[PDB]
């Protein structure tokens, strides 16, 4: 059973790697907007948590 579960573990590992790469790529792009919205446009007017 532990061997059988380790195969599930490895599937999860590959999935996790893919998701990791995608998340990092998103952050890299979003950084530019953050540097650009330092004009005090983000604090409440743009970031409407509602």
């Amino acid at each position: 059973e532990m061997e059988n579960v380790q195969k599930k573990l490895r599937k999860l590992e590959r999935d996790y790697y893919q998701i990791r790469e995608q998340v990092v790529s998103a952050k890299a792009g979003w950084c530019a907007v953050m540097r650009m919205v330092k004009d005090n446009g983000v604090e409440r007017r743009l970031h409407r948590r509602e």
Partner: peptide, 24 residues
Amino acid sequence: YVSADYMRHANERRTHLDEALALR
């Protein structure tokens, strides 16, 4: 017009991060 799409982007990033943390 602007805030809607800004939040869309933020939410996609939040979602993928959450999935990654659960997987981790």
